[PDB]
Amino acid sequence: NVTHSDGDVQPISTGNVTIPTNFTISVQVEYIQVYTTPVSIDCARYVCNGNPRCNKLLTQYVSACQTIEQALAMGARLENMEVDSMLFVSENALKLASVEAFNSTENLDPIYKEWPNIGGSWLGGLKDILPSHNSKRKYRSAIEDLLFDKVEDYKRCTGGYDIADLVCAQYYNGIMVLPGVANDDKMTMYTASLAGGITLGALGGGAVAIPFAVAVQARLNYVALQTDVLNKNQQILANAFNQAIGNITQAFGLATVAKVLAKVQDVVNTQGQALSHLTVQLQNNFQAISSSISDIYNRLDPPSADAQVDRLITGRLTALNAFVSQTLTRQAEVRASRQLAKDKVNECVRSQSQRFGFCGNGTHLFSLANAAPNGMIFFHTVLLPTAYQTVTACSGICASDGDRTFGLVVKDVQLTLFRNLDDKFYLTPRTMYQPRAATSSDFVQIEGCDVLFVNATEIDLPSII
């Protein structure tokens, strides 16, 4: 069948209505590709394998090599600029963005002396998202290590100490893979800084931290103004979070995890196959006596040898042009997904978005991120209601003073007006059942009353006018 749900909450303030009340935490995970792994190809070497005689024939195709090399060089240049303008860090955030920093008290602002560390309650989840020094490679989170484990130097290729592997063998054919390690390291610092900044108290200077729970409470107030200040519901949300991350970490080492793993391996497989396909074509004797130029020249005199080499030259230039077209098409694809990754960071991680359904399925609370092969992972933490509160809503209030009748409506269209058991008027946001008593500044006075308005009495009037 197709997934069923209760349905969306509608902006209804006219009768009995349901407001989401009892909440827990759900964590959704997604992968977005940010960059490709660029390849620089030496056209002359790929087509003519270091043969001075083939290289002369190839000058008749000098414009063909110029186009191939220019197209790849320009693609790589544009991508490079686009990524450099995206990734940045904050020095103070980066200092706080570690498991060891979060588990310590020394970086905490003194007014929080009643809190043992930064995010103690939330640390059971954060420990697998934040970078750690006691890890593989350097400065990576537990989840990042799992993704990279599941999924370069050229000095050694001219050593002659052993028989060359796949990478040096490609190098010998004019295929160079440009460094992508830096982009991996930059992405790790980028995502770490974004997470660390959540708990950074000020931008003046000094890695002075606030508790994670305090930062979370601020996010809850953006969802709905919180009025139950005496209701310590935070431990519940923290526990649900820690459990969700536990199941995600285990799943990597949960439909969203399966989707991430499938997409990530598809990206690495596609790039691998696309380039290995280029190399196999060098075994192709395009209706020639041999695929080897050197073997042709050692068998035939130049009048005939050149005729055979010419067949190989046109065949190889054609294969090389096909490669370039496929490469450029993928770069365009990734550019579009980069814009999406950038929008997700800016709207889900660095701010509180007002775009419904954008930052995962549910009511967004916060987002964290990790590095992944060729891109990044977003952890969308959302609020999930388990039960609803029913209230009896009013579309407005009909009031009178002497012979003058008029209506009062709620100024803020996002609030539901309802009447309590004490017959008093309350307002509540529709995203969470967080009621507050209504006051006079919350109403707008209009000329008439509708049929769905409730009649006010002398008892209510002083509190609503």
Ligand X SMILES: *[C@@H]1O[C@H](CO)[C@@H](O[C@@H]2O[C@H](CO)[C@@H](O)[C@H](O)[C@H]2NC(C)=O)[C@H](O)[C@H]1NC(C)=O
Positions that interact with ligand X (CB under 6 A): 3-6, 15-16, 21-22, 85, 88, 99, 103, 111, 123, 127, 243, 246-247, 250, 361-362, 384-385, 387-389, 392
Strand 175-177 to 16-33 pairing:
unpaired
Chain residues 202-231 in contact with other proteins, contact rule CB under 8 A: 202-204, 210, 214-215, 218-219, 221-222
Classify residue 4 as left (phi > 0), alpha (psi -120 to 50) or beta: beta
DSSP-derived 3-state class of residue 108: strand
Q: Count residues contacting ligand NAG (CB under 6 A)? A: 4
Residue owning tokens 């599941």: 150
Q: After which residues is the chain broken (C to N over 2.5 A)?
A: 151, 253
Distance of alpha carbon 368 from alpha carbon 95, whole angstroms: 17
Stated length of the chain:
465
Q: Tell me the two tokens of residue 268.
A: 């690495």
How deeply is 161 buried, as exposed, middle or buried, from its count of CB atoms within 10 A (0-12, 13-18, 19+)?
Answer: exposed
Q: In the bound complex, what is the minimum distance in angstroms from residue 433's beta carbon to ligand X? A: 8
**Binder among 28, 33, 36, 381 for other proteins (CB under 8 A):** 381
Q: Compare residues 157 and 461 and give the one whose CB is closer to other proteins.
A: 157
Cβ of residue 403: shortest distance to other proteins, in angstroms?
28
DSSP 237-302: HHHHHHHHHHHHHHHH--HHHHHHHHHHHHHHHHHHHHHHHHHHGGG--SSSS-S-HHHHHTTS-H
Q: Are strands 454-455 and 397-401 parallel, antiparallel or unpaired?
A: parallel
Cβ proximity to ligand NAG: between 161 and 356 the closer is 161
Shortest Cβ 320–other proteins spacing (Å): 13
Contacted by 1, from ligand NAG, other proteins, ligand X, none: CB < 5 to 8 Å by type: ligand NAG
Question: 163, 182, 413, 459: which one contacts a copy of itself (CB under 8 A)?
Answer: 413
Contacts of 411 (CB under 8 A, 6+ apart): 441, 442, 443, 444
Among 318, 333, 405, 455, binds a copy of itself (CB under 8 A): 333
Residue 319, Cβ neighbours under 10 Å: how many? 18
Which residues, other chains included, contact 258 with Cβ-Cβ below 8 Å and sequence gap of 6+?
Answer: 251
Contact region with other proteins (CB under 8 A), list: 6-14, 139-147, 171-179, 397-405: 171-179
Q: Which of 17, 417, 449, 456 touches other proteins by CB under 8 A?
A: 417
Q: Is 455 in the site for ligand NAG (CB under 6 A)?
A: yes
Site for ligand NAG in 112-171 (CB under 6 A): 161
Total site size for other proteins, rule CB under 8 A: 155
Q: How far is CA 338 from CA 32, 264, 442, in A?
A: 8, 15, 43
Q: How far is the CB of 126 from ligand X (least distance, A)?
A: 8
State the binding string over 91-120 for a copy of itself (x if CB under 8 A, else -): --------------------x--x------
Q: Is 426 in the site for a copy of itself (CB under 8 A)?
A: no
Stretch of 10-18, 102-110, 256-264, 311-319 lying at the interface with a copy of itself (CB under 8 A): 256-264
Applying the rule CB under 8 A, the residues between 357 and 386 that interact with a copy of itself are 357-358, 372-375, 377, 379, 381, 383
Return the number of the residue (140 or 380) whose C-beta is nearest a copy of itself: 380
305: left (phi over 0), alpha (psi -120 to 50) or beta: alpha
Residue ranges that bind ligand NAG, judged by CB under 6 A: 1, 161, 454-455
